[PDB]
Structures are given as C-alpha cells and as structure tokens.
Amino acid sequence: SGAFEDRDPTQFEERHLKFLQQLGKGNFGSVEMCRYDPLQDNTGEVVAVKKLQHSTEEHLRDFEREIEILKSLQHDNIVKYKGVCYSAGRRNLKLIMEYLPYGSLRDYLQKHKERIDHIKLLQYTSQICKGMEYLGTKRYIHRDLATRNILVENENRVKIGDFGLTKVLPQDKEYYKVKEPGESPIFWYAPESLTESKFSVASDVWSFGVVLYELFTYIEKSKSPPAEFMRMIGNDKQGQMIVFHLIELLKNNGRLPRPDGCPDEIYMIMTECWNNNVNQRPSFRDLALRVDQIRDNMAG
Ligand SMILES: COc1ccc(-c2cccc3nc(Nc4ccc(N5CCN(C)CC5)cc4)nn23)cc1
Numbered sequence: 001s002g003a004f005e006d007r008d009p010t011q012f013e014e015r016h017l018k019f020l021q022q023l024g025k026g027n028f029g030s031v032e033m034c035r036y037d038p039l040q041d042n043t044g045e046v047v048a049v050k051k052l053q054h055s056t057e058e059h060l061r062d063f064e065r066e067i068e069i070l071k072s073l074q075h076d077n078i079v080k081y082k083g084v085c086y087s088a089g090r091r092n093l094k095l096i097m098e099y100l101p102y103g104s105l106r107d108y109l110q111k112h113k114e115r116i117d118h119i120k121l122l123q124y125t126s127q128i129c130k131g132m133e134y135l136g137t138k139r140y141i142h143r144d145l146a147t148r149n150i151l152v153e154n155e156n157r158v159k160i161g162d163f164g165l166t167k168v169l170p171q172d173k174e175y176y177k178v179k180e181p182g183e184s185p186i187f188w189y190a191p192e193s194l195t196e197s198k199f200s201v202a203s204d205v206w207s208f209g210v211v212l213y214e215l216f217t218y219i220e221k222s223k224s225p226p227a228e229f230m231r232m233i234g235n236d237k238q239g240q241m242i243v244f245h246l247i248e249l250l251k252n253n254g255r256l257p258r259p260d261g262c263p264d265e266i267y268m269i270m271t272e273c274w275n276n277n278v279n280q281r282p283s284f285r286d287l288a289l290r291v292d293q294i295r296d297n298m299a300g
Pocket of ligand 1: 097100103104161
C-alpha cells in the first residue's frame with residue numbers, strides 16, 4: 001500500500017464523508033448533514049456540507065469567495081468553517097461546516113415557542129449584534145440578515161450564517177453598490193438598498209431592525225414582514241407595483257407595527273434602526289451595549 005501524512009485537517013476526504021440527512025436548498029446551493037468517519041468505525045464528527053447546484057464559472061467564483069469569507073471568520077456567533085472536500089475525483093467543491101442541531105432561528109421560533117421567553121429573545125438579539133460587530137472589523141457587509149439566515153446551536157446560542165451575499169468594503173469606501181439580477185428580500189431592505197442598490201454597515205443595521213421585529217412576532221402566521229407590508233400596500237398588488245408602493249411607504253415614515261406584547265423600549269430600538277437617514281442609525285456596538293444593559297437591569 002502507501003504511507004500517509006496529514007498536515008491539513010481542513011481537507012476532508014470524499015470517501016470518509018457519509019450522508020445522514022438533507023437539510024435544505026437555497027437559490028444556488030444545497031446543504032446536507034454528514035458524518036466524517038476516517039477511522040471507518042461508524043463514528044466521527046457530524047458536519048454540515050454545502051454544494052453548488054451548478055458550478056458555472058460565475059457560481060463557482062462566488063462560492064469560492066463565500067468559502068474564503070467563512071474561513072476568515074472566527075467568532076462564537078458565526079457558523080464555524082471546518083474545511084473543504086474536493087469530491088468527484090477533485091472535480092467538484094464542497095464546503096464543510098459545523099452542524100447546528102436546531103436549524104434556522106425562523107423555524108426554531110415557530111416550533112419551540114414552549115422554550116422561548118423575552119429573556120431568550122434578547123439573548124439572541126445580543127449574540128446577533130456581536131456577530132455583526134465582528135463582521136464590521138473585517139469590513140464585511142452581510143446584505144441578507146433575516147431570522148431564516150441565523151442558525152441555532154442550542155437554547156442559549158445562535159450563529160449568523162448565509163455569507164454567499166457578503167461584500168468587502170475597500171478601505172476608502174463606506175458603501176458597496178451592487179447591481180444584481182433576480183429576486184431581492186425587499187421587505188428586509190433599507191430604502192437606499194431598494195432605490196440605489198447601496199449596501200453598507202448601516203443597511204445591515206436596518207435589516208437587523210427587521211430581524212428584531214421578527215423575533216418579537218414569534219414568527220406568527222400573519223405578522224411576518226412580507227405579510228404586514230402587503231397589508232399596508234394592498235394585498236392584491238403584484239410585480240413592480242409592490243416595489244413602487246413599498247418605497248413610497250418607507251420614504252414617508254410607513255413602518256412595521258409594534259408587535260403585540262413587545263416592550264416600548266424594544267420597539268424604540270427597531271424604530272431607531274429604521275431611520276431613512278443612514279448616518280443616524282445606531283452602530284452594532286451601540287446596539288449590543290443597549291441590549292445587554294436591558295438584559296442586565298432585570299432582577300435576575
Ligand atoms: C438553505 O438551507 C440551508 C440549510 C442548512 C444550512 C446550514 C449551514 C451550516 C450549518 C448548518 N446546520 C444546520 N442545521 C440544520 C438542522 C435542522 C434543519 N432542519 C430543517 C428541515 N427540517 C424538516 C428538519 C430540521 C436544518 C438545518 N443547517 N446548517 C444553511 C442553509
């Protein structure tokens with residue numbers, strides 16, 4: 001046979017990666033749960049594995065950028081990069097990550113409400129802010145914050161995922177304009193993202209406000225951002241008319257309503273994130289401190 005030397009534990013061997021479960025599909029990718037069992041004894045770490053539907057030059061370039069981004073991040077509230085697998089005899093690329101048992105925050109909130117109180121919601125809020133502070137130190141703009149894109153390790157820890165839209169700000173620039181085809185999560189977008197395709201830390205703060213709103217609605221059927229905005233706009237509107245009305249609504253101070261049972265001071269945080277004036281939105285550091293002070297002021 002042959003000798004073996006492993007000095008790159010970020011390279012996962014295809015033959016040792018065994019399928020456990022399908023986890024989901026996005027626009028251009030899918031994710032599976034696998035076991036990595038190099039000792040072939042039916043044991044090994046469980047991992048999440050992302051693969052591209054169609055490895056076009058463009059899709060692959062974007063996927064490699066996503067991998068580089070995730071690899072560059074090391075923080076308790078960001079999904080952990082583990083490595084890559086060069087499958088199909090090294091003619092396909094897969095991204096290996098830690099597996100988070102409770103899936104998306106959006107699904108967790110919907111299915112495990114017996115386990116969730118306002119204290120928990122504020123803990124998740126704080127962790128999301130801290131993850132976002134960390135992204136800011138690398139000049140990364142996420143562009144797709146939403147509860148469906150946050151993952152849940154356990155009762156006490158959530159992690160930001162979904163870095164396939166992330167942009168890197170050059171040192172002398174404060175926004176990134178991105179002209180892209182296809183669909184946008186318009187009900188999470190800042191007005192300047194809708195009108196000018198401009199993205200920035202401040203546009204992530206806007207979307208964070210929508211995330212906070214989502215948390216305090218407990219993902220109740222008719223209370224979602226798309227459901228509430230469509231109610232306001234007119235439920236029968238279709239196509240570009242939805243966008244025209246959403247922009248006009250937001251520009252003149254139309255906003256998502258205070259969720260039932262949501263404390264006025266939590267709604268105030270949302271409203272401050274949803275400032276048309278980009279420079280007046282709070283920073284993620286401001287938000288983390290405020291939320292942790294709210295948490296700490298409780299009797300226990
Ligand atoms: C768009 O789909 C995905 C799917 C998985 C991931 C991902 C990335 C990196 C790590 C990671 N851990 C989990 N865990 C997970 C656990 C349970 C579920 N369920 C969804 C399907 N349900 C019917 C069962 C639970 C989904 C994901 N998902 N996940 C990201 C996007």
